[PDB]
């Protein structure tokens, strides 16, 4: 609709992953990264046998994915996030790649529950016509800020480091 594009460093390689989000302020609650089945990164960084795993389609309506074997470095935390090929990510929409926040997104929770991924809460429950007064927590420099202030500060920090930009 109107979001931000974020670059993630792929661990042990000189390659990057661009993801699109409409909730950049929930970045400290990221558990995984997921790309579409038809994403270029599948043909570039993975074996041809990945198509055999993909066709095994079996669990429809259920959020399923395959761990690629690669991790991405979190931009602000000393930690890595696993990278998946997921059935619920659409290639034709934006970058065909997402970051997952299971504590505040139903689709991300269903995926994390299946693959035992961590659940990290970041919003404590209370464009310019209204202000969302829910407060950020577990989010380093975003702590204590309302959701509205946090959306602004995270974008300034991503732009300041050359790893994020506004995307219409
Ligand atoms: C879940 N819904 C959206 C609802 C709003 O998205 C939410 C998003 C977060 C949170 Br926290 C809460 C809601 C965070 C963490 N996941 O990021 B979020 O913002 C993006 C958000 C942007 O979509 P929109 O419609 O709001 O403009 O959808 C996710 N996304 C992006 N590209 C994607 C892609 N190719 N295939 C799938 N999903 C993608 C991203 O998920 C996904 C959805 C289902 C089908 C087509 C397109 C989007």
Author numbering: 221 to 276, 280 to 349, 353, 378 to 418
What does the publication say?
Here, we report the discovery of potent boron-based compounds that inhibit an unprecedented target of Wolbachia, leucyl-tRNA synthetase (LeuRS), and demonstrate that inhibition of this microbiota target is an efficient approach to arrest the growth of its host. Altogether, these experiments show that benzoxaborole inhibitors of Wolbachia LeuRS are prodrugs that, in an enzyme-independent manner, form adducts with adenosine substrates. The adducts then bind with potent nanomolar affinity into the Wolbachia LeuRS editing site and efficiently compete with the physiological substrate norvaline.
In the absence of AMP, Cmpd6 and Cmpd9 did not bind to Wolbachia LeuRS; however, in the presence of AMP, the compounds were potent LeuRS inhibitors, with dissociation constants of 44 and 6 nM, respectively. Cmpd9 has stronger affinity than Cmpd6, which arises from a more favorable binding entropy, likely due to a more optimal conformation by the alkyl-phenyl group of Cmpd9 to bind into the Wolbachia LeuRS drug pocket. The potent nanomolar affinities of the two compounds are explained by a combination of multiple polar and hydrophobic interactions established by the inhibition adducts in the editing site. Specifically, the amino-methyl phenyl of Cmpd9 packs between residues F311, L313, and Y316, and makes several hydrophobic contacts, and at the same time, the phenyl group makes two favorable aromatic π-π interactions, one parallel-displaced with the adenosine ring and one T-shape stacking with Y316. This conformation is further stabilized by hydrogen bonds of the adenosine-phosphate to residues Y316 and S221. Other key interactions, shared by the two compounds, are a hydrogen bond by the oxaborole oxygen-1 to T241; and the three hydrogen bonds established by the 3-aminomethyl to F322, D328, and D331. In the adduct formed with AMP, the phenyl and amido-thiazole groups stack against the adenosine base and enable multiple interactions within the Wolbachia LeuRS drug pocket. Conversely, the B factors of the adduct AMP-Cmpd9 are invariably low for all atoms, including the phenyl group.
